[PDB]
Amino acid sequence: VMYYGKGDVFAYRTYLKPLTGVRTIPESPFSGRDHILFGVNVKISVGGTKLLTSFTKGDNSLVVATDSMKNFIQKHLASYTGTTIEGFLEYVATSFLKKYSHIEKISLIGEEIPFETTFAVKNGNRAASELVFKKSRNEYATAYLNMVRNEDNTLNITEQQSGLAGLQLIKVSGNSFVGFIRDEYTTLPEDSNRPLFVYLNIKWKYKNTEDSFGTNPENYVAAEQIRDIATSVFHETETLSIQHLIYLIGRRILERFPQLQEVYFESQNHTWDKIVEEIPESEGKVYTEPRPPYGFQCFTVTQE
Amino acid sequence: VMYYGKGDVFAYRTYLKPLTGVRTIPESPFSGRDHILFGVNVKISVGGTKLLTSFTKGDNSLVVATDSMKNFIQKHLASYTGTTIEGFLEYVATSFLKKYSHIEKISLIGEEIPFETTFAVKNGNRAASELVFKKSRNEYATAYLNMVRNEDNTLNITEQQSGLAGLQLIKVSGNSFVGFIRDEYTTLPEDSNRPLFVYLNIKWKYKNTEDSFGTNPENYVAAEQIRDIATSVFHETETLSIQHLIYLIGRRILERFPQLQEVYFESQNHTWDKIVEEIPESEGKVYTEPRPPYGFQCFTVTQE
Amino acid sequence: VMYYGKGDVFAYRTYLKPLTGVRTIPESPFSGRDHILFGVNVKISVGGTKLLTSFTKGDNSLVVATDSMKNFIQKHLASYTGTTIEGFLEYVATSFLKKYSHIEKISLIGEEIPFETTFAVKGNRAASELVFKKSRNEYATAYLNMVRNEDNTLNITEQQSGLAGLQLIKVSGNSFVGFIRDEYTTLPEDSNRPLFVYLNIKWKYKNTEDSFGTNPENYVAAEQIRDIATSVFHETETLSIQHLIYLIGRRILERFPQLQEVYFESQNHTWDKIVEEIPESEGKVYTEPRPPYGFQCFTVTQ
Amino acid sequence: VMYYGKGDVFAYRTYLKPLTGVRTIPESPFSGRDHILFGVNVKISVGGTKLLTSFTKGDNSLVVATDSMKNFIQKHLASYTGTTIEGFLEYVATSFLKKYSHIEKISLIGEEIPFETTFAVKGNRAASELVFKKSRNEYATAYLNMVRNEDNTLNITEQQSGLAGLQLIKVSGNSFVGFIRDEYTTLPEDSNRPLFVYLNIKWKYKNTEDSFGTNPENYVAAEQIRDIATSVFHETETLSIQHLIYLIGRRILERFPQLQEVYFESQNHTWDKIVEEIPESEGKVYTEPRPPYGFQCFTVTQ
Numbered sequence A, B: 001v002m003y004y005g006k007g008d009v010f011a012y013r014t015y016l017k018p019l020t021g022v023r024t025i026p027e028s029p030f031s032g033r034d035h036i037l038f039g040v041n042v043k044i045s046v047g048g049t050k051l052l053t054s055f056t057k058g059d060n061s062l063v064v065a066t067d068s069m070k071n072f073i074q075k076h077l078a079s080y081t082g083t084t085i086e087g088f089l090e091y092v093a094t095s096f097l098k099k100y101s102h103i104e105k106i107s108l109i110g111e112e113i114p115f116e117t118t119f120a121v122k123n124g125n126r127a128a129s130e131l132v133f134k135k136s137r138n139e140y141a142t143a144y145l146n147m148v149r150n151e152d153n154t155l156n157i158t159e160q161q162s163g164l165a166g167l168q169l170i171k172v173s174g175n176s177f178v179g180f181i182r183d184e185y186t187t188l189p190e191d192s193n194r195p196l197f198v199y200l201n202i203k204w205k206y207k208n209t210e211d212s213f214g215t216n217p218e219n220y221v222a223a224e225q226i227r228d229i230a231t232s233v234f235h236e237t238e239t240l241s242i243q244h245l246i247y248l249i250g251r252r253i254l255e256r257f258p259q260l261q262e263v264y265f266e267s268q269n270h271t272w273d274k275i276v277e278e279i280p281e282s283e284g285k286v287y288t289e290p291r292p293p294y295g296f297q298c299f300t301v302t303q304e
Numbered sequence C, D: 001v002m003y004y005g006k007g008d009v010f011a012y013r014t015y016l017k018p019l020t021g022v023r024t025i026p027e028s029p030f031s032g033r034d035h036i037l038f039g040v041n042v043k044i045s046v047g048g049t050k051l052l053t054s055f056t057k058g059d060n061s062l063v064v065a066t067d068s069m070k071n072f073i074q075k076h077l078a079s080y081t082g083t084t085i086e087g088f089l090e091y092v093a094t095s096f097l098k099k100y101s102h103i104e105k106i107s108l109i110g111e112e113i114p115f116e117t118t119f120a121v122k123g124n125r126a127a128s129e130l131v132f133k134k135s136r137n138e139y140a141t142a143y144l145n146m147v148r149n150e151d152n153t154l155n156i157t158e159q160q161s162g163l164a165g166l167q168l169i170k171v172s173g174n175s176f177v178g179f180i181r182d183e184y185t186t187l188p189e190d191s192n193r194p195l196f197v198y199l200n201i202k203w204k205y206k207n208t209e210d211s212f213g214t215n216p217e218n219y220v221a222a223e224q225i226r227d228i229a230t231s232v233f234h235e236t237e238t239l240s241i242q243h244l245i246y247l248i249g250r251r252i253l254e255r256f257p258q259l260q261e262v263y264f265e266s267q268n269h270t271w272d273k274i275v276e277e278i279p280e281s282e283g284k285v286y287t288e289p290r291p292p293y294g295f296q297c298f299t300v301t302q
């Protein structure tokens, strides 16, 4: 292994070209992105056999300073004329390999820094502000791209993946976990109605990488729409386990987006412990935080 | 000083009585709370001279175990028939002093664990789910209460405060910071148009503590409404500093809510560093995260 | 309330004047600080009635920029000729009030950023004078409040030193029994628990000048306080955290008669026991509890 | 991809069999572990084609509950008769595959929860056998993957030990010069910087059984790796982080010929210099940089 790079390259751009012309799905009102504020946290990794002596000999002649990579990324956000994080990464990657001919491979991660709208009164009505936004620490979109330089100096994308990270959903009823193995290691009671709390990280891969860029936006798959599929399927489903749930979410995603090749889930179980089961004259209960150990699932659904 | 207690007492209640009948303000659509899910993180502190020997002699005869306080809090959330965190704290406090006659003082903090609604398709339309909610790590409501037992065994509230914590707002334009002291310690340039980014913690105190409880809900001041005042005033104001902004927010709060005695602000400055000032054929710019040192302000506005 | 300031002012200085000549105590090997690397995280807050219109009118005429406060602190760390965080806070506070006549009050917090020695071979193995390890464990703290009086004199109104983030577990020799059992009590009595405490310990001096280090025989080092706490924890068959922190405070006040008080903020993080008995062993297995934690706050006075 | 499991399985055992008889090296005083307190945080992941219908149909018939995996790990820590996290992972993995015939693959991570000795007076000052300090600094790690073959035999396919979270700063004797200067370069060359690195160091054995501790002469302790890194950092006039980690890896492989490779994940956290020159002193003042950090990933092979 031989790579080096720069992480936590925060970059905030105002007035990026808006994303419009997307194709809708029943589960989601998503219709585009205004891009008054477009925030991204980028990580860049680069490799190439010509870098060996920077490790073995202390020779920095072919070292692009990691600080310079930060400058590169931030200056390219200013010149980017596209509309997606996925497209931004392609722009940075192609540009970097063109600039630095001794680099053979580049890997990029971009994570959305999401902002929400806020209310303001002006001119007699209350409406969403075009100026004031709220920083969100909830779920966020992600993108990943790897690009290589070939022997003939052409550049190729070798892997692309988009995602939604940090979605935390609790369904208060309509979930069971029963029928699992009861042996000398089992102390978990069967539960026919639990308040399932899942953390979800959902990643998708396109059949055609061009569709990830937003250039023909009707082919773009938006993290917002993926979120809304997840919440809809969770609601609709009498869940039998998290495994059961995430397969159903993945199937719905692939049905709604035939341009996707596969969808990958990282889920965690954070369901609360029950403290009070019955409340007089109420359907309510009281729960509390569990001990730290958490269940998790890793699972891919493919169009095949 | 002599106190002991329990922190991080998480408690989640389903189907609390809903909060309705509130009085509206222009800056906010807030009209109540459904309370399908009501989450609170409670901290309890207790004191009393009768506790001295638990420290000086190792005598636990009068020690309520901190673990038992956790049970007390969680069981009282199940029996609580009110509609606010402020009212819950009063219920816990009164109940605890009634149970434990050698305790002279109790202090409670309750912090909302907020959940947001999600979309689901069912029966032919998409609508907000009554079952699936999204855990939010953004701003949250707070409450504080201190209660004492007097010589005649009556109980009195000695301080009450409500709040909104963790509000993070960025206004992209329409802010200046100019005209400050320029001396041998000054390297900050004057800026006539900066993207001010503030973190805000806003706390209010009522003229009449009864108004905090929700029993006559038209007198309750909701953290949601306070949030919306903050965003509205930020939008409306050509800010001259954070100090300037927070005074204006506080004045608007006291004007909208004449039942409040005062409002207290803890603000922090997290404004980004500018990297690209001019983008061809655009009003956009690029910014990045600053170094760690952050400005802060602490400021009270009173009805007087 | 009306103040403003700057937080997370990190400042790292190399080769501060060494802290030497400290009175050593039985519990601790501490005898000074080399100060090859001196790291502090400073928070400054200032007030004055003349600041009112910066809030009420947007008038920045009398605003020292918080960014400039950052520069002030970092440049004063470069010119500081003393040997403690406590003395550094006094230097900053006096300098700031002397510079800015419209400021009536200043409050400072300084938190050590601690670095530990590491081994190098140079031959034989010894502590390096160049390579240090950044520690995210316990750290020293200092607090100072200073005011300008009506007669233009300056006065320290509050001073407090401390040790923060000490996390100690004693595997045996601790009990928690005899507490109230009623409808809300589910906790079992335990005659031998592995008490795990977090400790924040703060102390005040009878004479504020003893905090500065200028006469090092009267300086109380956070390193010595740590080693008193572990020594007392070891020696004591504890009956509660309450019981332990009282005895730690008594020992501190006995070792350091120049101190007026010691204040504790403790938390309980004791593990849940999962396996009570292991064939042919003294040992047991435990695991992390649910999040709710007990805490205690207590002052011992000289 | 199809697996599931349990993370943050904390398990604390008292009086594990001590690790003794380790080969000591010049760079490190390490000679074993008392194991009065042994803490590990375990993550388990399992797979098998027979798990498919638990996803596709909601059939829990063949689901070992993740909660039960937690119980499995904690109870096996109570019955473990060995002396390392690496050997504990092997015990859990073999036991789990022997118990659950429908599981084809298991992957384990174990992370040390480290505890440091403290002083007590008992008389004279000495290390306590009862009171320990929880450390949030560097910690040992272990990784193991085991599979069931077509012929029902079990095989370790992957094993890796490590040291995580080592944060080291060298105040002088580091340079970063000679790198590419073009339209995107603003970083100044620096012939004497206080290089601050975070290090995660991982190693693989030629023979997986040397990882278990069963013959302690062949065991490579994370404590020894730490002290090699600080020793090499001290000795080296570094020319980059790249240059440093290569030399640390070379030294590790020379000291431990039983190792097949060492892998590094490094990050740069060097401070920004604020004051270049201090009257009549060697010293300087620095402060924390903006968030973006450099990193390096590199493998050295025996």
Ligand SMILES: O=c1[nH]c(=O)c2nn[nH]c2[nH]1
Residues within 6 Å of the ligand: A177, A188, A240, A241, A242, A243, A269, A295, D004, D063, D064, D065, D066, D067, D068
């Ligand atoms: O949904 C669940 N899947 C699981 O595998 C599991 N194990 N314990 N609880 C669980 N819940």
Ligand SMILES: O=c1[nH]c(=O)c2nn[nH]c2[nH]1
Residues within 6 Å of the ligand: B177, B188, B240, B241, B242, B243, B269, B295, C004, C063, C064, C065, C066, C067, C068
């Ligand atoms: O709004 C601000 N207030 C301040 O006091 C300040 N100081 N630096 N920047 C600042 N911005």
Ligand SMILES: O=c1[nH]c(=O)c2nn[nH]c2[nH]1
Residues within 6 Å of the ligand: B004, B063, B064, B065, B066, B067, B068, C176, C187, C239, C240, C241, C242, C268, C294
């Ligand atoms: O030392 C303790 N003090 C307490 O007050 C307490 N309550 N539960 N456990 C406890 N342990």
Ligand SMILES: O=c1[nH]c(=O)c2nn[nH]c2[nH]1
Residues within 6 Å of the ligand: A004, A063, A064, A065, A066, A067, A068, D176, D187, D239, D240, D241, D242, D268, D294
């Ligand atoms: O050691 C370093 N290696 C690098 O690649 C680098 N880039 N900026 N600073 C650096 N320091």
